[PDB]
Amino acid sequence: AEVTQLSNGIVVATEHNPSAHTASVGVVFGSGAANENPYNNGVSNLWKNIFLSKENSAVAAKEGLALSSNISRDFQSYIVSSLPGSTDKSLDFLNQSFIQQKANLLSSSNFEATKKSVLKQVQDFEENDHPNRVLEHLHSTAFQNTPLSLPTRGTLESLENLVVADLESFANNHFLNSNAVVVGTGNIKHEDLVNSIESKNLSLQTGTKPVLKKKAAFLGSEVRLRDDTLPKAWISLAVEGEPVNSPNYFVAKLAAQIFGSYNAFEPASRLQGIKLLDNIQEYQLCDNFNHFSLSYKDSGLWGFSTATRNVTMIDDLIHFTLKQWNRLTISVTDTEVERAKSLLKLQLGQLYESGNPVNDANLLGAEVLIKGSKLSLGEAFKKIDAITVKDVKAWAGKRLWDQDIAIAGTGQIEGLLDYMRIRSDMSMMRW
Amino acid sequence: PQSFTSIARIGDYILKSPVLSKLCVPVANQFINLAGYKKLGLKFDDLIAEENPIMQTALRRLPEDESYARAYRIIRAHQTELTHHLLPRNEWIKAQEDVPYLLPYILEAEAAAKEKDELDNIEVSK
Amino acid sequence: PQSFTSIARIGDYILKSPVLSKLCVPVANQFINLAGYKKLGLKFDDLIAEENPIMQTALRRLPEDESYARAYRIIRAHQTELTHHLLPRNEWIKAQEDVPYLLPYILEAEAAAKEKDELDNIEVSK
Amino acid sequence: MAFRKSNVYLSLVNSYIIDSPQPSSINYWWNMGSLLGLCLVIQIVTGIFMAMHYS
Amino acid sequence: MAFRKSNVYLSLVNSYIIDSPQPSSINYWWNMGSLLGLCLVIQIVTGIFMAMHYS
Amino acid sequence: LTVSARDAPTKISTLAVKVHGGSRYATKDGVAHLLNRFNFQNTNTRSALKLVRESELLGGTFKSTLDREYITLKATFLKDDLPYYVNALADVLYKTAFKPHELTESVLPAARYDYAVAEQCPVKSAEDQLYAITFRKGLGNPLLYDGVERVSLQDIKDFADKVYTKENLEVSGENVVEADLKRFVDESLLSTLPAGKSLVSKSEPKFFLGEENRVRFIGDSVAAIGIPVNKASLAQYEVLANYLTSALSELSGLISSAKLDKFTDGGLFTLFVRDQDSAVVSSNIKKIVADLKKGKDLSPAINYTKLKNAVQNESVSSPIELNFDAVKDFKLGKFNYVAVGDVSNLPYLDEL
Amino acid sequence: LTVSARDAPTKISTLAVKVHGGSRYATKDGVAHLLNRFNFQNTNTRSALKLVRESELLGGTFKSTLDREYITLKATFLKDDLPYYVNALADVLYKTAFKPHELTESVLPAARYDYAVAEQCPVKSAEDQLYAITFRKGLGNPLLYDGVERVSLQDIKDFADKVYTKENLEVSGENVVEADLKRFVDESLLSTLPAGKSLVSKSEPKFFLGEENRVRFIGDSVAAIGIPVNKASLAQYEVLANYLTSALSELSGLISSAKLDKFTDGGLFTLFVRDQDSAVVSSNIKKIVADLKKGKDLSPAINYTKLKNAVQNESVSSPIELNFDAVKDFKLGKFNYVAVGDVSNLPYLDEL
Numbered sequence A: 001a002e003v004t005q006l007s008n009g010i011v012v013a014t015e016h017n018p019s020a021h022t023a024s025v026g027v028v029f030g031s032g033a034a035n036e037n038p039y040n041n042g043v044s045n046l047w048k049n050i051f052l053s054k055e056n057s058a059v060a061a062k063e064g065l066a067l068s069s070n071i072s073r074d075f076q077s078y079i080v081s082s083l084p085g086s087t088d089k090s091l092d093f094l095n096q097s098f099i100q101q102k103a104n105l106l107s108s109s110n111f112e113a114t115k116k117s118v119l120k121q122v123q124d125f126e127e128n129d130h131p132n133r134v135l136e137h138l139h140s141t142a143f144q145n146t147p148l149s150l151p152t153r154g155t156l157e158s159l160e161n162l163v164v165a166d167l168e169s170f171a172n173n174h175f176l177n178s179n180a181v182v183v184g185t186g187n188i189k190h191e192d193l194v195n196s197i198e199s200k201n202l203s204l205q206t207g208t209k210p211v212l213k214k215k216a217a218f219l220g221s222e223v224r225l226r227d228d229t230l231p232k233a234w235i236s237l238a239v240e241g242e243p244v245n246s247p248n249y250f251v252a253k254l255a256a257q258i259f260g261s262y263n264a265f266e267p268a269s270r271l272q273g274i275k276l277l278d279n280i281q282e283y284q285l286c287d288n289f290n291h292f293s294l295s296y297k298d299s300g301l302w303g304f305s306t307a308t309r310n311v312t313m314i315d316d317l318i319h320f321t322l323k324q325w326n327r328l329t330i331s332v333t334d335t336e337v338e339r340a341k342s343l344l345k346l347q348l349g350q351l352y353e354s355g356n357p358v359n360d361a362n363l364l365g366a367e368v369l370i371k372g373s374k375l376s377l378g379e380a381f382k383k384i385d386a387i388t389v390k391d392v393k394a395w396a397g398k399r400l401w402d403q404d405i406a407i408a409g410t411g412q413i414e415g416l417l418d419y420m421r422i423r424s425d426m427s428m429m430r431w
Numbered sequence B, C: 001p002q003s004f005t006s007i008a009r010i011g012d013y014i015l016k017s018p019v020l021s022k023l024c025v026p027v028a029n030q031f032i033n034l035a036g037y038k039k040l041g042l043k044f045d046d047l048i049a050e051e052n053p054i055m056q057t058a059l060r061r062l063p064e065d066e067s068y069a070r071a072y073r074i075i076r077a078h079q080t081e082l083t084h085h086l087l088p089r090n091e092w093i094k095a096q097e098d099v100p101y102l103l104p105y106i107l108e109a110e111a112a113a114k115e116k117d118e119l120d121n122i123e124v125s126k
Numbered sequence D, E: 001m002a003f004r005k006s007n008v009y010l011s012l013v014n015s016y017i018i019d020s021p022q023p024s025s026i027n028y029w030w031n032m033g034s035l036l037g038l039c040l041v042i043q044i045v046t047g048i049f050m051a052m053h054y055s
Numbered sequence F, G: 001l002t003v004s005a006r007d008a009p010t011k012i013s014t015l016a017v018k019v020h021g022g023s024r025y026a027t028k029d030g031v032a033h034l035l036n037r038f039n040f041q042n043t044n045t046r047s048a049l050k051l052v053r054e055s056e057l058l059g060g061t062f063k064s065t066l067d068r069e070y071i072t073l074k075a076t077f078l079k080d081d082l083p084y085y086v087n088a089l090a091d092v093l094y095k096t097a098f099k100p101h102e103l104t105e106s107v108l109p110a111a112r113y114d115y116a117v118a119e120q121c122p123v124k125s126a127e128d129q130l131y132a133i134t135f136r137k138g139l140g141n142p143l144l145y146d147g148v149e150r151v152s153l154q155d156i157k158d159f160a161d162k163v164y165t166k167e168n169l170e171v172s173g174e175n176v177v178e179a180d181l182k183r184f185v186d187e188s189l190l191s192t193l194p195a196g197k198s199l200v201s202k203s204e205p206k207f208f209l210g211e212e213n214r215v216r217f218i219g220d221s222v223a224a225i226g227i228p229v230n231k232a233s234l235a236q237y238e239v240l241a242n243y244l245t246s247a248l249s250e251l252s253g254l255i256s257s258a259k260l261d262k263f264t265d266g267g268l269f270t271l272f273v274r275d276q277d278s279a280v281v282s283s284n285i286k287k288i289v290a291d292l293k294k295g296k297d298l299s300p301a302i303n304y305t306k307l308k309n310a311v312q313n314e315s316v317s318s319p320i321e322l323n324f325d326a327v328k329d330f331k332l333g334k335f336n337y338v339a340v341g342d343v344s345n346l347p348y349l350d351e352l
């Protein structure tokens, strides 16, 4: 297992695996939804569905290729997959359809049909997908009036004002050679890829991207979307967390692993070594929860999400969870830290060593764009093993004890108390 | 207050000793006959206080034909007590019917609660 | 306390009289503007006290799009009251929007309760 | 329901001395608690009337 | 649940002065009822200490 | 007792035990579902709580999975802890306790939740209907437990003694040294199991053509067709399922799903049409059947099928139906049909 | 507007209005059920509470009844109060209020109770399946409302304006002077109704033979067969239904029920087998079908059928299929079949 970075004008990164049976080749750009403004929000999500449109997918399918695309807050990628003997055809398809010609894809008949399909997807997301849209509303209230607040899909109000000239204006500012990384994963050797690119003279455009002026900033706030005709309540809560390239990046992920995830209907999930589960199962305070530690280029979020049918005891669920977060400053034990070390290593090993080269192409390109290289899994395991109890207590005294929070919620949330009752539970008046 | 695991540990030590089972076992038979619960139609496991989580677990796991018969013996003993009488002598519990029917369910629930308490307050070593 | 059937009987007698509708109707328009509920964004039927069985029947039978809009006006009026302010002047209720939306549901429930009371305390004759 | 269960002050009376479920086998030793309530009323009422004449 | 809701004597305290739902728009005129409770305590406590010296 | 493994320079390993004990071998309705929920409960020597706490400190988890052919027991763990997980999987097959209070408190409430989740999906209930009217006894058995046949605790223990035998299972490992795995298996309690017999039948299963079934349901409407496939025709219907859901076909906007389930003795092709308005469902399924009856040319989709087969086979032990080069044409013959939802406004079999 | 009556020296009278508005004419699923529960609700001139209190002091009651052909409005009362009840039945057909709060508070909770009672009887759900697979649109419509098609308040008022017409109803009276009844009907609001058209079709309905359906159910198991009957064969199948459930037949201990439903254009013969053990149901239905295929002689049961027909026709207006003298033989041909309950242990159609 080894990565190889090489620059000749174009940054080329590979990750060779001679045991895999497919190969994957694409390009990742270093702009996401946090490089848009409130008037062209959704222009990245439209460029994805233009690339995945029917006439473009049909040209690829006669060659034997498949297409993927992903939109995030800091990056976006466009990936072609094939059998290991036809990576030259997949690199040709990325040259013709995406680099040279774009007036074929941006015809008026293709643009209006794609815009209709995207507007239906965003409408069905806002009406049916309740856990993921509460987490989207948590980002917009915590980073309000700041580039990290814009949703990755766009809104229905901002998507209908978009024309063809808005997509060409975004492509001239961000789809550049100094913003791009060419990636290759699966069964493909590194020097075979750099000689196929150098046998041509690929270059997107010369110049740099615009520089935004407002930096990300956390603000303690809340947003409530009450809907009494829904059968549950869905709540997210977080503090300000760690960015990428932070010295406390792995300590924050281990602290979330201490409290973990839960499913009340799976019998083995009920037997986990988490002390919070004693209070919750006595009166059945929720159906599921999960803790997270998200990281971006400038900021991050640390907290949990939950879903509940017990709508008269919502205040007991928030109170018991926040009293366990107080113990990370005061009285976290050594056996809880050793359990979280083994489970964080199992979770990280499953994320980076799945058998999908499309997942590996997204992870490799996003990390080379920020850091310039990639940290191996062997070196990440040695940083996790060196964390002590005193590292956890010093991190939680800075980020958790007596700090501001952000709350989002939907459904039957009448039993959720107001902000200052929840804010005062971030300290004990004992220590 | 004293657990049934502790009572069975002391009691099985006496019953294996051939010299201690000649002294204490005749005294225990006179103690039970002077107690008089069998003349009201009760077994000893009907007399155990039930307002605790271990006993509520063991009473849930009892088979339902034995749960119906336990409820009739308790109700008949309350009615005999308020009339200030005893049962007729052909309705008394015999010694070969005074068996510990609830004791294996109690000992199983006590061992599971002890193992959970040891895993929740635990040390490690490298 | 005074029923809406009695209020409508007195009020419709004044409005049909051409001499009484020239005297009382200018006084009633000054009375409503001095009351000031429209500057908080309320209609008059939002102000009716609801803790009685007739009003609970009429609020159940209201269509749901009007029930959602009534709940928003009451919540907005409580928030404006605690800040000791008034609404902006472009958000005030206009006179052509201050319609009795709840009055036909109230009058229908009152007539059904009167007919039930007359049939329950009734005479007969051969 | 009946008025002894719906009124705010009579439901406290009803759930304590009217409808409260008792075990069927308690004997006369369980009557001492209500005699103590009568003794406290007797000591309070004879106490006030003597205090009108005491220095 | 929390101990302020499960205890027999603390749940009366919790449902009256801790968790009781109030309307959000009441003004300072709604504070007179709790001042009357403070006045009754002041009159009772100064009354006992003066009664130790009164004939 | 077949043992095989593959190796890699990878941090994470996976171990699996494949038992021929799926719902096609079940004695009563839903017994294979209830045995699947009894796995990793209390053992005679170790409680279920002790197994979760011990493997969390080593970094491993357990899972059990049921389909129509297999019951699969799986572990995922850090690589150097291999002998702990060989012995833990052997104790489940050998000395599960089967306590009566475990059936009441854990197994039966977990199986009621599995049935209630799958009951709200009309696509899943249309697939259950298509298996029942095509094969009628073996592959047509119901997958989950619903309680129309009552299953006692002794029925579960009799089914466990029938399928947990040495001639009826195979052991596989990923990122595992093969010479170490064969040594740890021979020392474990797997070699102390009864020999028994293999349950896998050799002959072709009996099938039926031209059947119909209609179910009323509150929600979306589904129309679905199903074709049974023999072993010599598995390559032709695999190209057809990838062609119909790709951009090479003009019918792909009307089709919700299409796939081919494969077994060692044959398979079943399925196709689904889903919408909330039943006038759209009736218009879509009439155009699909009429266009497939005229005939299609499948040879432009051969290279696309070879890519999709290699992606899917990275988790499977690869039944090699890999000769796609002879696939040229297809014409629709006889088939089965089910309709779920607003059945008063859905077509009949003789109308299409 | 047909009016007829019979007279007697009897204290009690009965008046009925028969509308051709059953579930075989319904526009959506369950609209005829919801119109049947709207009868004797509030009228424009009189509330439903006032109608109950007034007729109780006179000694009368009202009822509405739905079947597959008719909606029937009925009154039973003391004899000399006839003009009050002619006018009360005329106001229901003419000026029912159809308030939206009456649909929410009264009609829909009453129709949910009707559906939940009939859902627990597996004999009734087997008869609903036999009608659906035999006729498929007219007589195969569902009888009750379940909510898979939503029905608005305007849908109910459109169906009432379609069936409450003068060419679509008939008035009948028992213990009623006929010359007085024709005078009171012509003075009432029934003569102010629209003329309209009759909904009764003249031709034979379309039927299907050799169909099958299976439903899973927790409870008893039912096996049932069904045969469609034309108009010339109604006398033969009436003798067969009385012969099979009498002491003249050795098969009567195995049969739970057998009957013949009659209409003006034909009928449907049914037979049912019910037991809580499905091995008894499978043994019973195999002996019934095999013995009916060899042939039976029906002529010893002719005089017994003529007695049973006269007892049943005392409440019916007597469709005269009364020539039982030509009935000699019967041999079973093609038929339809349904199975409800533990369907894994019940026979299939080609196995019997």
Ligand SMILES: CCCCCCCCCCC(=O)OC[C@H](COP(=O)(O)OC[C@H](O)COP(=O)(O)OC[C@@H](COC(=O)CC)OC(=O)CCC)OC(=O)CCCCCCCC
Residues within 6 Å of the ligand: C084, E027, E028, E029
């Ligand atoms: C007798 C011994 C008892 C002593 C204590 C009793 C107090 C009785 C006073 C009467 C009363 O309770 O009602 C008061 C009422 C105002 O009610 P409101 O909620 O609408 O005003 C909220 C304010 O805008 C924000 O008030 P905020 O909360 O922002 O600041 C507090 C303010 C002082 O507040 C008080 O002391 C309340 C008594 O602090 C400052 O002034 C800052 C500069 C130092 O006032 C009125 O409605 C009319 C004003 C005259 C009332 C006098 C009539 C007496 C017979």
Ligand code: HEM
Residues within 6 Å of the ligand: D040, D043, D044, D046, D047, D048, D050, D051, D054
């Ligand atoms: C639980 C309640 C009470 C108890 C146990 C109690 C007990 C006593 C006793 C033992 C004596 C001495 C009697 C003697 O030997 O002469 C006494 C005297 C007295 N008590 Fe009480 N008392 C109670 C309540 C009250 C109250 C509530 C009052 C006044 C309002 C009161 C007023 C007096 C007076 C005036 C005397 C002196 C007259 C006398 O000697 O009888 N007592 N009390």
Ligand code: HEM
Residues within 6 Å of the ligand: E040, E043, E044, E046, E047, E048, E050, E051, E054
């Ligand atoms: C609601 C409670 C009470 C009220 C409104 C009240 C009121 C009064 C008033 C108006 C006076 C006359 C004061 C003066 O002008 O000098 C007085 C005197 C007195 N009260 Fe109270 N009282 C209360 C409670 C009590 C209690 C509970 C006690 C004894 C335990 C008590 C003991 C006395 C005494 C000893 C005096 C005479 C001394 C003096 O003049 O201040 N009071 N009370």
Ligand SMILES: COc1c(O)c(C)c(C/C=C(/C)CC/C=C(\C)CC/C=C(/C)CC/C=C(/C)CC/C=C(\C)CCC=C(C)C)c(O)c1OC
Residues within 6 Å of the ligand: D015, D016, D017, D020, D033, D034, D035, D036, D037, D038, D040, D041, D044, D045, D048, D049
């Ligand atoms: C197990 O179930 C039971 C149960 O079996 C029983 C019997 C009882 C009832 C028994 C009791 C003892 C309850 C009654 C309590 C008392 C009687 C205590 C007395 C309480 C007081 C507050 C004493 C104050 C009373 C007075 C009369 C003082 C006032 C004096 C005055 C007005 C005289 C002065 C007037 C002038 C003009 C000088 C239960 O409550 C109960 O629980 C559900």
Ligand SMILES: COc1c(O)c(C)c(C/C=C(\C)CC/C=C(\C)CC/C=C(\C)CC/C=C(\C)CC/C=C(\C)CCC=C(C)C)c(O)c1OC
Residues within 6 Å of the ligand: E015, E016, E017, E020, E033, E034, E035, E037, E038, E040, E041, E044, E045, E048
């Ligand atoms: C709508 O929501 C509300 C709400 O708005 C408010 C304001 C309250 C406020 C509550 C109160 C104001 C409480 C009311 C006050 C009382 C009940 C006071 C009662 C008075 C006493 C108990 C007097 C007792 C005094 C003594 C025993 C002192 C005795 C003196 C001694 C012992 C001297 C010491 C002797 C020696 C020798 C040293 C609510 O409870 C409430 O919920 C419903």
Ligand SMILES: CCCCCCCCCCCCCCCCCC(=O)O[C@H](COC(=O)CCCCCC)COP(=O)(O)OCCN
Residues within 6 Å of the ligand: D006, D007, D008, D009, D010, D012, D013
């Ligand atoms: C915590 C310990 C202290 C509690 C003590 C409880 C016992 C108190 C005394 C009980 C005696 C019953 C008093 C009469 C009950 C009838 C009250 C009534 O009719 O309610 C009112 C009349 O209002 C009054 O005037 C009350 C006067 C109270 C006088 C007490 C000194 C009408 O009855 P209502 O319809 O409101 O009943 C529903 C209540 N939720």
Ligand SMILES: CCCCCCCCCCCCCCCCCC(=O)O[C@H](COC(=O)CCCCCC)COP(=O)(O)OCCN
Residues within 6 Å of the ligand: E006, E007, E008, E009, E010, E012, E013
């Ligand atoms: C006459 C008017 C009466 C009005 C009543 C108002 C209530 C006044 C109480 C004020 C608060 C008192 C705090 C009590 C502390 C918690 C109770 C407790 O500790 O109970 C017990 C221990 O028992 C005791 O020692 C009682 C102490 C006597 C208190 C006498 C003042 C706590 O243990 P437990 O687990 O049983 O609590 C759950 C009860 N449902």
